[PDB]
Protein backbone atom coordinates (compact mmCIF):
# COMPACT_ATOMS: atom_id res chain seq x y z
CA UNK A 1 0.00 0.00 0.00
CA UNK A 2 1.35 3.38 -1.08
CA UNK A 3 -1.66 5.54 -0.27
CA UNK A 4 -0.86 8.79 1.53
CA UNK A 5 -1.36 8.75 5.27
CA UNK A 6 0.17 7.99 8.64
CA UNK A 7 1.55 4.50 9.30
CA UNK A 8 2.78 2.42 12.22
CA UNK A 9 6.29 0.92 12.02
CA UNK A 10 6.09 -2.57 13.55
CA UNK A 11 8.39 -5.49 14.24
CA UNK A 12 7.82 -9.13 15.21
CA UNK A 13 11.46 -9.58 16.31
CA UNK A 14 10.52 -9.09 19.97
CA UNK A 15 7.74 -10.38 22.18
CA UNK A 16 4.56 -10.29 20.10
CA UNK A 17 4.08 -7.42 17.64
CA UNK A 18 5.86 -4.28 18.82
CA UNK A 19 5.41 -0.77 17.48
CA UNK A 20 8.83 0.79 17.13
CA UNK A 21 7.62 4.04 15.58
CA UNK A 22 5.41 5.90 13.12
CA UNK A 23 5.78 7.59 9.76
CA UNK A 24 4.25 9.52 6.91
CA UNK A 25 3.56 8.29 3.37
CA UNK A 26 3.31 11.22 0.96
CA UNK A 27 3.87 11.38 -2.80
CA UNK A 28 4.99 7.72 -2.74
CA UNK A 29 7.78 8.32 -0.20
CA UNK A 30 7.77 7.04 3.36
CA UNK A 31 9.12 9.46 5.94
CA UNK A 32 10.15 8.60 9.50
CA UNK A 33 12.80 9.41 12.07
CA UNK A 34 16.21 7.79 11.62
CA UNK A 35 16.26 6.40 15.15
CA UNK A 36 13.08 4.40 14.48
CA UNK A 37 14.53 2.23 11.68
CA UNK A 38 18.27 3.00 11.86
CA UNK A 39 18.01 3.14 8.07
CA UNK A 40 16.97 -0.47 7.60
CA UNK A 41 14.68 -1.65 4.83
CA UNK A 42 10.93 -1.90 5.48
CA UNK A 43 8.19 -4.28 4.37
CA UNK A 44 4.83 -2.97 3.13
CA UNK A 45 2.73 -6.06 2.55
CA UNK A 46 4.50 -8.07 -0.14
CA UNK A 47 6.65 -5.08 -1.07
CA UNK A 48 10.06 -3.89 0.05
CA UNK A 49 10.68 -0.23 0.86
CA UNK A 50 14.34 0.56 0.44
CA UNK A 51 15.96 3.53 2.17
CA UNK A 52 16.69 6.46 -0.10
CA UNK A 53 18.01 9.34 2.02
CA UNK A 54 18.84 9.82 5.65
CA UNK A 55 20.83 11.79 8.16
CA UNK A 56 21.52 10.84 11.77
CA UNK A 57 22.01 14.40 12.94
CA UNK A 58 18.69 15.56 11.53
CA UNK A 59 17.30 12.18 12.76
CA UNK A 60 15.31 11.71 9.53
CA UNK A 61 15.08 9.08 6.80
CA UNK A 62 13.06 8.65 3.63
CA UNK A 63 12.13 5.56 1.66
CA UNK A 64 11.49 5.10 -2.08
CA UNK A 65 12.37 8.70 -2.91
CA UNK A 66 13.66 11.99 -1.59
CA UNK A 67 12.17 13.78 1.38
CA UNK A 68 8.89 15.40 0.24
CA UNK A 69 7.68 17.28 3.35
CA UNK A 70 8.17 21.07 2.91
CA UNK A 71 5.86 22.83 5.30
CA UNK A 72 7.13 24.79 8.28
CA UNK A 73 5.59 26.02 11.51
CA UNK A 74 4.56 29.67 11.18
CA UNK A 75 5.99 30.57 14.59
CA UNK A 76 2.58 31.91 15.69
CA UNK A 77 -0.27 29.39 15.34
CA UNK A 78 -1.29 26.25 17.15
CA UNK A 79 -0.56 22.95 15.46
CA UNK A 80 -1.80 19.40 15.84
CA UNK A 81 0.21 16.35 16.72
CA UNK A 82 -1.36 13.33 15.03
CA UNK A 83 -0.24 10.93 17.72
CA UNK A 84 -0.28 7.23 16.86
CA UNK A 85 0.58 5.51 20.17
CA UNK A 86 1.21 1.76 20.31
CA UNK A 87 -1.99 -0.26 20.35
CA UNK A 88 -4.11 2.92 20.35
CA UNK A 89 -6.13 4.72 17.69
CA UNK A 90 -4.59 7.73 15.97
CA UNK A 91 -5.58 10.91 17.82
CA UNK A 92 -5.18 14.61 17.06
CA UNK A 93 -3.86 16.78 19.87
CA UNK A 94 -3.73 20.54 19.37
CA UNK A 95 -1.03 22.64 20.99
CA UNK A 96 0.86 25.90 20.73
CA UNK A 97 4.51 25.01 20.09
CA UNK A 98 7.33 26.41 22.12
CA UNK A 99 10.80 26.92 20.71
CA UNK A 100 14.16 25.20 20.80
CA UNK A 101 16.77 27.97 20.58
CA UNK A 102 20.07 26.65 19.21
CA UNK A 103 23.34 28.18 18.05
CA UNK A 104 22.12 27.64 14.48
CA UNK A 105 18.59 28.99 14.83
CA UNK A 106 15.25 28.33 16.41
CA UNK A 107 12.86 25.48 15.66
CA UNK A 108 9.41 24.75 17.00
CA UNK A 109 8.92 22.30 19.84
CA UNK A 110 5.85 20.53 21.21
CA UNK A 111 5.40 19.74 24.94
CA UNK A 112 3.46 16.50 24.65
CA UNK A 113 4.33 13.14 26.25
CA UNK A 114 3.56 9.83 24.54
CA UNK A 115 4.92 6.29 24.95
CA UNK A 116 8.02 4.92 23.34
CA UNK A 117 6.90 3.89 19.88
CA UNK A 118 5.12 7.12 19.01
CA UNK A 119 8.31 8.59 17.41
CA UNK A 120 7.63 9.70 13.83
CA UNK A 121 4.09 10.86 14.41
CA UNK A 122 3.41 13.89 12.19
CA UNK A 123 2.80 17.44 13.33
CA UNK A 124 0.36 19.35 11.13
CA UNK A 125 -0.65 22.91 10.43
CA UNK A 126 -4.24 24.09 10.01
CA UNK A 127 -4.00 23.26 6.29
CA UNK A 128 -3.20 19.65 7.13
CA UNK A 129 0.39 19.85 5.84
CA UNK A 130 3.09 18.00 7.76
CA UNK A 131 5.42 20.57 9.30
CA UNK A 132 7.63 17.93 10.94
CA UNK A 133 7.86 14.71 12.93
CA UNK A 134 7.55 14.12 16.68
CA UNK A 135 9.96 12.12 18.78
CA UNK A 136 13.41 13.74 19.01
CA UNK A 137 13.67 16.06 22.01
CA UNK A 138 14.64 16.68 25.62
CA UNK A 139 13.61 15.85 29.17
CA UNK A 140 13.18 19.01 31.24
CA UNK A 141 13.46 19.84 34.96
CA UNK A 142 9.75 19.04 35.37
CA UNK A 143 10.72 15.56 34.16
CA UNK A 144 8.34 15.89 31.20
CA UNK A 145 9.18 15.51 27.52
CA UNK A 146 9.50 18.23 24.89
CA UNK A 147 9.89 17.18 21.23
CA UNK A 148 11.47 19.16 18.44
CA UNK A 149 9.31 19.75 15.38
CA UNK A 150 11.82 17.95 13.15
CA UNK A 151 11.52 18.81 9.47
CA UNK A 152 13.69 17.88 6.51
CA UNK A 153 14.59 19.69 3.29
CA UNK A 154 12.97 19.11 -0.12
Amino acid sequence: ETTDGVYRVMTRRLLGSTQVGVGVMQEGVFHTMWHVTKGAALRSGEGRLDPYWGDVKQDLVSYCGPWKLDAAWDGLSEVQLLAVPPGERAKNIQTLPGIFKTKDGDIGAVALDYPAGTSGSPILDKCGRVIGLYGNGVVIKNGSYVSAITQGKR
Binding site: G5, T95, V138, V146
Partner: protein
Protein backbone atom coordinates in the same frame (compact mmCIF):
# COMPACT_ATOMS: atom_id res chain seq x y z
CA UNK B 1 12.58 -7.02 10.09
CA UNK B 2 10.17 -4.09 10.22
CA UNK B 3 6.86 -3.55 8.41
CA UNK B 4 4.34 -0.73 8.15
CA UNK B 5 0.57 -0.60 8.71
CA UNK B 6 -1.71 2.26 7.74
CA UNK B 7 -3.15 4.12 10.74
CA UNK B 8 -5.07 7.04 9.25
CA UNK B 9 -5.40 10.08 7.04
CA UNK B 10 -3.34 13.17 7.79
CA UNK B 11 -5.94 15.84 8.50
CA UNK B 12 -6.56 18.68 10.90
CA UNK B 13 -9.31 17.83 13.41
CA UNK B 14 -11.72 20.73 13.86
CA UNK B 15 -12.49 20.28 17.56
CA UNK B 16 -9.41 18.49 18.90
CA UNK B 17 -8.35 18.21 22.52
CA UNK B 18 -6.10 21.22 23.14
CA UNK B 19 -3.23 20.87 25.59
CA UNK B 20 0.47 21.34 26.21
CA UNK B 21 2.48 24.41 27.10
CA UNK B 22 4.98 26.38 24.98
CA UNK B 23 8.41 26.30 26.62
CA UNK B 24 11.24 28.35 25.13
CA UNK B 25 14.40 26.33 25.73
CA UNK B 26 18.08 26.80 24.92
CA UNK B 27 19.26 23.51 23.42
CA UNK B 28 22.28 22.04 21.67
CA UNK B 29 22.21 19.36 18.97
CA UNK B 30 25.18 17.02 18.78
CA UNK B 31 26.57 15.03 15.87
CA UNK B 32 24.60 11.93 16.99
CA UNK B 33 21.30 13.77 16.57
CA UNK B 34 20.75 14.11 20.32
CA UNK B 35 19.40 17.28 21.88
CA UNK B 36 20.60 18.51 25.24
CA UNK B 37 19.57 21.39 27.48
CA UNK B 38 21.88 24.36 27.97
CA UNK B 39 21.34 25.53 31.56
Amino acid sequence: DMYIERAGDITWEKDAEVTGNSPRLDVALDESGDFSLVE
